[PDB]
Design a protein around this ligand. Structure first.
Ligand SMILES: NC(=O)c1ccc[n+]([C@@H]2O[C@H](COP(=O)([O-])OP(=O)(O)OC[C@H]3O[C@@H](n4cnc5c(N)ncnc54)[C@H](OP(=O)(O)O)[C@@H]3O)[C@@H](O)[C@H]2O)c1
Ligand SMILES: NC(=O)c1ccc[n+]([C@@H]2O[C@H](COP(=O)([O-])OP(=O)(O)OC[C@H]3O[C@@H](n4cnc5c(N)ncnc54)[C@H](OP(=O)(O)O)[C@@H]3O)[C@@H](O)[C@H]2O)c1
Ligand SMILES: N[C@@H](CC(=O)O)C(=O)O
Ligand SMILES: [Zn+2]
Ligand SMILES: [Zn+2]
Ligand SMILES: [Zn+2]
Ligand SMILES: [Zn+2]
Lengths: 337, 336
């Protein structure tokens, strides 16, 4: 049995909960949790904000841990017992559809299985397919690496999709967990970087992360002044803002890319897309290769999430901390046991 | 419980019946019963040890259409079923877990992708390959001609992907043999402008009918001089060393010369030719499992089928000589 922290109903506090994982599947890897970040998606799933949560629910999906068991078909896949590894939002894919066999496992045509649906990292152990267990660079900071596995890849993927380079002008809306990692990554890439934030208390630290300037995200006149100045704007905000001034802040050929899980549909004038050949995009975390590459880049560039550590035994205080908007900038749980 | 095959016992030798024990089925392996197997010039090169890494006895053949007869213990939840019609190409094995493999670039496996031939190929009644290299086929594909698409087809398809060829591209093909005639057919289906460079005037009318806009003598440098700057891409399939400079000069600015032919004498590439016009010279090795899957679907939907001459597998030594003598029109296929 595995000891975890589970929600028994939508929006509930987490209780100690033990479950039987069954036998190790042939492709499975069992990982002993050392750290696990807390992601806004974890809150969304606990609260069933998206409509597919099943209870008891063991969330957590930003895991740094060590390999403790390898399935029968997972023995010569480059992993060894004791290896420090990461697990992100996704745990399973089929491996043989066109998407998987082309290196696009996140888009598995059978549906890639989220780690949380499989029982997640708010626990002492968890399991994933070996393809989704991410090897780590030797010198990576272990305490802060966890959020890179979801927050990091999620903002890294648009940089890949839209071919961002050092000459790009990139904005980031919402400097929380995902957003602040975005700022650090763009800085390491030499880009022009603008942070859009609703909290003046964050301004000085966000400038120190590498933002060239911080703009009030809730001021339409501030955005009006930036018309046509961005190649890419990444939205990480989960609430519905006035998006039109951000569309107009795009230069010709520019992209507005949302990774924030905005429930109210975006209102996208066809005339805004036509005049300037603009685009609106989304993406879901990333692929195993993109994760491997991100972790290596972050370690070599010394891009590390700004982290607040909590003991895993105080997970309910940690979760309320995030709900209350106090995460500076990502909360990470250290496993007790 | 052996596998009957046609093996070469020495470099350049004729093929003799040869039985071998494949061993236990590896967990990832798929055993395929051969229905057809193309003959590729790479088969001859391996038989003759032209490339210096052949091991004898050598069972060649790597353009296989067949049926799945057995699935290893880790190969049964991988979208394949016993009885399924499948293809196997030049490559049989890769590790699956290095960065190249897990990113969909299995042909570039960092442990070294294992050629089908090196672990016994398709000149046999059966062969085995990792499931990732077993290519599922579209329903309505012509199975008698499909075999060569698994190597000849993907090999000339890959530069079309690497160099982002579209219908407005101007593409030349040097050497209209097995690989080259498939490239002409593929380029025709894509709407490109297409020029064939050929050394054999007896092919000219057939190659025009395949879709070449014109056929130019591949051995006449003065004929290539008139086409200076007229091509975005030139694919070389020729295994011998030609006078390459006029082909480089036939590239427009930003154009690419791309060799899939296994030319032993190194290309002489003037830096000034690359600098003036921002040109490139490239190569590639067959392609990835996904690219193979996509190619088979495209070829079936577009009715791109290799022009094939069938031989019974028992007449394999006759078929090999037919290819050696330059008589293939345009790919020999062995029937099992
Ligand atoms: N697409 C994917 O694959 C993927 C992956 C992971 C997460 N997500 C989703 O991405 C979103 C952000 O995740 P996260 O972990 O970074 O959450 P987070 O730490 O709470 O960051 C959210 C940020 O958005 C801003 N924000 C929150 N409420 C706001 C409001 N009313 N008005 C203006 N700004 C507000 C705030 O930044 P400021 O203080 O700077 O204003 C806040 O820090 C979530 O919806 C998450 O579920 C998507
Ligand atoms: N890179 C890869 O991954 C890969 C994969 C498969 C094969 N290959 C290699 O590609 C090459 C072609 O294979 P293939 O099966 O298409 O061979 P093929 O059927 O023999 O075609 C070769 C063509 O090149 C021309 N040719 C031959 N000798 C010539 C000469 N002295 N001068 C001028 N042209 C000559 C001929 O075309 P014309 O009659 O029109 O002049 C001949 O038909 C081989 O070297 C093969 O090993 C590479
Ligand atoms: N068709 C037979 C013999 C042959 O193909 O030559 C097999 O077995
Ligand atoms: Zn997350
Ligand atoms: Zn899949
Ligand atoms: Zn071949
Ligand atoms: Zn590999």
């Amino acid at each position: 049995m595995i000891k975890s922290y589970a929600a028994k109903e939508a929006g509930g506090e987490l209780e100690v909960y033990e479950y039987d994982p069954g036998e190790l599947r042939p492709q499975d890897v069992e990982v002993q949790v050392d750290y696990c970040g807390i992601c806004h998606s974890d809150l969304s799933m606990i609260d069933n904000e998206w409509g597919f949560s099943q209870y008891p629910l063991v969330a957590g999906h930003e895991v740094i841990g060590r390999v403790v068991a390898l399935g029968s078909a997972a023995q010569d896949k480059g992993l060894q017992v004791g290896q420090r590894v990461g697990i992100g939002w996704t745990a399973r894919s089929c491996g043989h559809c066109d998407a998987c066999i082309s290196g696009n496992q996140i888009n598995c045509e059978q549906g890639a299985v989220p780690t949380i649906m499989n029982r997640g990292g708010f626990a002492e152990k968890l399991r994933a397919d070996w393809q989704w267990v991410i090897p780590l660079p030797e010198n990576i900071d272990i305490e802060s690496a966890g959020p890179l596995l979801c927050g990091g890849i999620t903002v890294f993927k648009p940089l890949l999709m839209h071919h961002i380079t050092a000459t790009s002008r990139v904005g980031v809306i919402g400097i929380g967990g995902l957003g602040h990692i975005a700022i650090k990554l763009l800085h390491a890439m030499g880009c022009e970087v603008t942070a859009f934030s609703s909290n003046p208390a964050k301004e000085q630290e966000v400038l120190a992360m590498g933002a060239d300037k911080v703009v009030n995200s809730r001021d339409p006149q501030a955005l009006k002044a930036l018309a046509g100045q961005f190649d890419l704007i990444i939205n990480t905000v989960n609430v519905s803002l006035d998006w039109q001034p951000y569309f107009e802040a795009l230069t010709y050929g520019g992209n507005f890319h949302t990774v924030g899980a905005v429930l109210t549909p975006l209102s996208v004038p066809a005339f805004t897309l036509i005049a300037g050949d603009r685009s609106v995009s989304g993406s879901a975390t990333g692929t195993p290769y993109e994760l491997r590459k991100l972790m290596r880049f972050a370690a070599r560039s010394k891009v590390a999430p700004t982290t607040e550590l909590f003991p895993m035994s105080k997970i309910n205080d940690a979760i309320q901390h995030v709900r209350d908007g106090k995460a500076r900038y990502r909360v990470v749980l250290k496993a007790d046991y």
